[PDB]
Amino acid sequence: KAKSIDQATLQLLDKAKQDGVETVWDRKADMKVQCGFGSAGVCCRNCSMGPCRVSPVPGKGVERGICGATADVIVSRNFARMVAAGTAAHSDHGRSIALSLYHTSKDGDIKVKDENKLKEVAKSFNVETEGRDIYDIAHDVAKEGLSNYGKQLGEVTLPPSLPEKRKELWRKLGVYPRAVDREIAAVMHSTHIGCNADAEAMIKMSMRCSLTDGWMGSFMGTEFSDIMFGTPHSIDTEANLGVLEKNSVNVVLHGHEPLLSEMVVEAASDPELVELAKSVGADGINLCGMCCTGNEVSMRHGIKIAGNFMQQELAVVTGAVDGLIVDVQCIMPALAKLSKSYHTKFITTSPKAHITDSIYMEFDEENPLDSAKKILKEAILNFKNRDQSKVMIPELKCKAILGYSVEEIINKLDKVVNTQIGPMQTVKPLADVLVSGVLRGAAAVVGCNNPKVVQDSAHIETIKGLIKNDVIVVVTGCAAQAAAKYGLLQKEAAEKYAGPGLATVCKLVDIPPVLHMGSCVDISRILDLVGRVANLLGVDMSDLPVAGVAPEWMSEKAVAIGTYVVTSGIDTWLGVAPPVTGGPEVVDILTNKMEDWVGAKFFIETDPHKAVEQIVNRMNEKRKKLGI
């Protein structure tokens, strides 16, 4: 089968074959037929009595592990641990952001750039703002956010966009969230040998844990990032590997933590570093981003996006990356080995993400700007080691428009508001187009790449089908970057791909049919948007014609995201089967019984066209339930 639908990706794969280096595709081929027990989730290693593998087919073979655990128990515990790991990644990101907020000052490297957003957040956290210093408010807000992570007494703080009905449903079901780290610890405790051996209770614990990601960790990370670095607005950028410059220093920012990439962007305008780049024979400094850190700097500053997850290696294969600076998460360790075949300096910066044989330059949060400057200086000085005979940059780049935060979307919707009617600054125009049926619904396309799927194929096919069916699409993460590379993040795309109702809406509001809402933590924005719509219509989020899709997901973070999206009341389609087919009870809970609990459920569909059809049918069913 084809490795990708992206032509630049294919050219660089040919180059990697010529250079004798191996990619993620090569390692996937080397893995050959993957273990059936692990693929079905019926393998357990939770204690040293094991490893235990039970039959994925009930009634045949070994039925129980040594402790007596059934296939359903093993599957449910494995699924819960995936959710806990994803929640941990997102919560650690949000915790770093909250600590950065706590260390803001007027004359420091980290300031408050959006005071209005900070005051609204302070209102949401019961922090007084009138007649107060802005940084005192910021510190109080950071304290409340940090308490959300580890409070042992009392209730956590949740955003006002979350409907009261959803909160009450969670409380009745027993999944109402506690402090984030406490929920992670609870999931890890209940999967220990000889604890929870009941699939339904295990799934409910995992949902409870995922809620602390969706509504607390990711939400606080996003809002505090907006406070410190600015709320995203409509902004132009370029996407795909063609953004690399042969005649300039190329600095590629990979990872998830935004403070480092923000400081690197600021350092790139330093006169001394620009002069140094000129002195090493380069035209200038060309910052490019990848994955979620690329999404953040692109949403807030228009930094060009070099590529998504499965392109990271190919960025090095060009031979033009002088410095690859990585913080945490979704950083293929093979990059270190790959960097030996080129001049590239592979720089790790976080104590959480040491990588063997990489150059470690710890990013100092006490002096973020100076630390970023020294890291960037190492990248710039590496330009002298460039071998221009090994350089091949495909001439394939695509224009994209992004920056669609909830605030930006509301500002855009204000155009189609009659002044004599109003109100202004609400999601009411969006609610109106959804209720009238001009738009059939809204769908979030999120997730990673996965060698099991032709890279970016499922993302593009799902998005095109949805917008052709007058479903407005919001995108995050690597799916958003696939849309950017393909060219869907363009106003022209409305008349090229969208159906009649969505084309009319795009023309009236002057937006692309596909709205890039940011990184994987920025999925919280999607929640926020949906919540607002629900609160405007006086219904729960499970009554709306909305859906989420993860066509090509790979990460534990994706598992946690899908779990909290379903728990919030939004049906979720998974384009890659999770390792649960071995447990019939777990499959039945996730795809059938979940609808009785939270009004939504998982859909597993590896065919994107069938997924689009199912999404449209489900949205029409919910519309008929709602009367619209």
How many CA atoms lie within 13 Å of 226's alpha carbon, on the beta-carbon side?
28
Residue with tokens 């969505």: 502
Q: Does 45 help bind ligand SF4 (rule: CB under 6 A)?
A: yes
Task: Among 7, 17, 51, 424, indicate the residue that binds a second copy (CB under 8 A).
Answer: 51
- Could you give the CA distance from residue 219 to residue 327 in angstroms, rounded to a whole number? 20
**Rounded least distance, CB 354 to ligand SF4, Å:** 16
* Longest CA pairwise span in the chain (Å): 73
**Rounded least distance, CB 399 to a second copy, Å:** 29
Q: Considering CB distances under 5 to 8 angstroms, the limit depending on partner class, which of ligand SF4, a second copy, none binds residue 553?
A: a second copy
Closest CA to 570 of 522, 604, 531, 535: 531
Q: Which of residues 353-392 bind a second copy (CB under 8 A)?
A: 353-356
Stretch of residues binding ligand SF4 (CB under 6 A), selected from 30-38, 120-128, 212-220, 596-604? 30-38
Stretch of residues binding a second copy (CB under 8 A), selected from 109-117, 369-377, 449-457, 498-506? 449-457
**Rounded least distance, CB 73 to ligand SF4, Å:** 8
Residue 491 CB neighbour total at 10 angstroms: 13
> Considering beta carbons, is residue 39 or 248 the nearer one to ligand SF4?
39
Residue with tokens 């859909």: 603
Q: Which of residues 167-186 bind a second copy (CB under 8 A)?
A: 174, 179-182, 184-186
Q: Considering CB distances under 5 to 8 angstroms, the limit depending on partner class, which of ligand SF4, a second copy, none binds residue 352?
A: a second copy
- Could you give the CA distance from residue 242 to residue 190 in angstroms, rounded to a whole number? 48
Task: Among 51, 160, 281, 351, indicate the residue that binds ligand SF4 (CB under 6 A).
Answer: 51
Q: Does 67 help bind ligand SF4 (rule: CB under 6 A)?
A: yes
Residue 107 CB neighbour total at 10 angstroms: 5
**Rounded least distance, CB 353 to a second copy, Å:** 5
Q: Does 10 help bind a second copy (rule: CB under 8 A)?
A: no
> Considering beta carbons, is residue 231 or 555 the nearer one to a second copy?
555
The type of residue at 117 is K
Task: Among 47, 381, 508, 626, indicate the residue that binds a second copy (CB under 8 A).
Answer: 47
Q: Which of residues 184-203 bind ligand SF4 (CB under 6 A)?
A: 193
For residue 89, give Cα distances in angstroms to 213, 322, 334, 557.
Answer: 9, 28, 20, 7
Q: Does 37 help bind ligand SF4 (rule: CB under 6 A)?
A: yes
Q: Does 68 help bind a second copy (rule: CB under 8 A)?
A: yes
Q: Does 419 help bind a second copy (rule: CB under 8 A)?
A: no
> Considering beta carbons, is residue 37 or 573 the nearer one to ligand SF4?
37
Closest CA to 566 of 179, 84, 64, 83: 83
Is the distance from CB of 466 to CB of 483 less than 8 angstroms? no
Strand 546-550 with 571-574, pairing: parallel
For residue 502, give the H/E element and its range.
Answer: helix 500-509
For residue 336, give Cα distances in angstroms to 15, 29, 316, 390.
Answer: 19, 20, 10, 19
Strand 52-53 with 43-44, pairing: antiparallel
- List contacts with ligand SF4 (CB under 6 A): 35, 37-38, 43-47, 49-53, 65-67, 69, 74, 193
